């Protein structure tokens, strides 16, 4: 039998304590995997057992808990267990453009939008879920949809105002057999 | 090979003009194999279909 | 008719510049892009509205002018007059649904046929769709004439106008009898195979798109509907056109076919389905271009103050208020 452990940072502990029953239940019910949380090592330790139905169910679980730890909502992350092709392509915000201080803060700002509107609008059009950790952009969706989303997010951080960005991406969505 | 079908649930209307009905298909081959298919015409819950190809699966995701 | 032949060119072309970018073009913009004469263009516009050249629009805030159906027609004929193709007007006119046929005569006196596209969404889009129609039709007209086809000869295209060779006759739909039905049938059947050889299917090859010249020669017109042979239903549109002619000659002239052409030949012919260093002379030109742009920008802002309609509405209510007090 084999195992995979994934870390959890201190800012993500209290959600992992709250949502714990919503996390371990789908891991243990229809996947049939042993799961515990090592408080010493601060890792979610998941295992195979005798009750494990199939191989790669371990990998389904690994991706699920990873998604939750990155910041994705449990209901959204659950999709990784059921669906085949969903990926979390993540990149630093400073990968696209070298930005310092106040410029980076405005940069984060316009990915999000006022009331998080821009963030949600891309999530709608690209059929993805995006998460902004302070200086990281984690996106979750289909591969074609990720490559779409990474471009819109990217344009926003290298300047292009939200108004131009929506116009570009809605044309791209129309061609991709959506 | 020709396989007969059931209707488990009528989901919604697909198609350009709203002509196609998206329908949950149970098999009459005893298997609980639930494949979602698109039908042309009027289909109510409890209909029995004649699918030409059973290997096909309609627009999921 | 065309009497005025100076300022009318510049003003009407200036409308066409604004028509490509925006809907209704304001009178402020017109004079700036027609800088040759200043001030006296507003009386020219009042002469243009006398004819069906331009239409006035004062809805709520939008104040200006848009080009009409007939006004767009005059612009092409004015360009064809400078190319020495059109001089006088022939009166034999076949008014259709998609296009109008006008007889034109040159300097020589030789009569030619002119096609004017009348597509009839706002009128701005309708006069842009007619532009793409003529450029597409002239493209096929050049492509077929060069490749031995019995089509009218392409001469010149201007925006929506197409000048063609004058083939005078009657359409196949209004023909009672043909002296030799068999020879005409075999001629028409060859032309479907001819197009298929060049990788083309007519699509709507009927009796409504064929003209006989003295009951000897079959002439083909109207080409915006043509499709490629790479299409999945290539043989279907091929067979439908064959059966349309097969039945027609059996219906009208009572001729039964002995030859049944159903050959797929792609492609033995051309694929037509695709169809100190800087000299002072330069310094002068560059300085001139800078100085004109500074003057043109200032004239725009002077013309933008024309609002005259806003001042007229405000004055009417003030007279009513003072009298009632």
């Amino acid at each position: 039998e084999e195992t995979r452990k994934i870390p959890v940072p201190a800012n993500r502990y209290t959600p992992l304590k709250e949502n714990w029953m919503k996390i371990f239940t789908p891991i243990v019910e229809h996947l049939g995997l042993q799961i515990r949380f090592n408080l010493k090592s601060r890792n979610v330790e998941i295992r195979t057992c005798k009750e494990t139905k199939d191989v790669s169910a371990l990998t389904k679980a690994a991706d699920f808990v990873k998604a939750f730890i990155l910041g994705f909502q449990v209901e959204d992350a659950l999709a990784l267990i059921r669906l085949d092709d969903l990926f979390l392509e993540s990149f630093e915000i400073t990968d696209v453009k070298p930005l310092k201080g106040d410029h980076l803060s405005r940069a984060i700002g316009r990915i999000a939008g006022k009331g998080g509107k821009t963030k949600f609008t891309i999530e709608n059009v690209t059929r993805t879920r995006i998460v902004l950790a302070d200086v990281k952009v984690h996106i979750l969706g289909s591969f074609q949809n990720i490559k779409m989303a990474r471009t819109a997010i990217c344009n926003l951080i290298l300047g292009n105002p939200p108004s131009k960005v929506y116009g570009n991406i809605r044309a791209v969505a129309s061609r991709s057999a959506d | 090979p020709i396989k007969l079908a059931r209707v488990t649930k009528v989901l919604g209307r697909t198609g350009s003009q709203g002509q196609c009905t998206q329908v949950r298909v149970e098999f009459m081959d005893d298997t609980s194999r639930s494949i979602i298919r698109n039908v042309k015409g009027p289909v109510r819950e409890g209909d029995v279909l004649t699918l030409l190809e059973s290997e096909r699966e309609a627009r999921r995701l | 008719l065309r009497y005025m032949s100076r300022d009318d060119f510049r003003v009407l072309t200036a409308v066409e510049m604004g028509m490509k970018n925006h809907e209704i073009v304001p009178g402020s913009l017109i004079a700036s892009i027609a800088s040759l004469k200043h001030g006296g263009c507003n009386k020219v516009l009042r002469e243009l509205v006398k004819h069906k050249l331009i239409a006035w629009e004062r809805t709520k805030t939008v104040q200006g002018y848009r080009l009409t159906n007939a006004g767009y027609d005059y612009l092409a004929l004015k360009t064809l007059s400078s190319r020495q193709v059109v001089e006088s007007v022939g009166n034999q006119m076949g008014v259709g649904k998609e296009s109008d046929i006008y007889i034109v005569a040159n300097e020589e006196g030789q009569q030619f046929a002119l096609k004017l596209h009348r597509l009839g969404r706002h009128n701005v889009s309708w006069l842009y769709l007619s532009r793409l129609s003529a450029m597409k039709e002239f493209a096929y007209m050049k492509a077929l004439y060069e490749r031995k086809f019995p089509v009218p000869k392409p001469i010149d295209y201007n925006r929506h106008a197409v000048v063609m060779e004058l083939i005078n006759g009657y359409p196949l739909c209004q023909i009672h009898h043909v002296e030799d039905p068999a020879s005409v049938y075999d001629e028409a059947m060859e032309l479907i195979v001819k197009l298929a050889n060049h990788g083309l299917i007519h699509g709507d090859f009927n009796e409504f798109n064929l003209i006989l010249d003295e009951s000897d020669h079959i002439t083909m017109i109207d080409f915006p509907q043509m499709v490629s042979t790479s299409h999945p239903n290539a043989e279907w549109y091929f067979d439908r056109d064959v059966k349309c002619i097969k039945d027609f000659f059996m219906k009208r002239f009572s001729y039964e076919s002995e030859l049944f052409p159903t050959f797929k030949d792609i492609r033995r012919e051309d694929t037509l389905d695709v169809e100190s260093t800087i000299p002072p002379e330069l310094v002068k030109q560059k300085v001139k271009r800078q100085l004109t742009k500074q003057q043109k920008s200032a004239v725009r802002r002077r013309l933008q103050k024309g609002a005259n309609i806003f001042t007229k509405q405000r004055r009417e209510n003030m007279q009513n208020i003072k009298s009632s007090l």
Partner: protein, 51 residues
């Protein structure tokens, strides 16, 4: 050395020839704009009318 040093000194001489040539054009356009400014302002005062 001598190979790189001569190659760099050739590019220095190209740029020195270049900004002399750029300054010469900057005075040529400045002298031509100023005389065309007068010849346009001349029309405003006189030689513009009807009769």
């Amino acid at each position: 050395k001598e190979d790189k040093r001569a190659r760099k000194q050739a590019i220095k001489e190209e740029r020195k020839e270049r900004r002399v040539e750029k300054k010469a054009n900057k005075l040529a356009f400045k002298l031509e704009k100023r005389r065309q400014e007068k010849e346009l302002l001349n029309l405003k005062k006189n030689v513009e009318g009807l009769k």
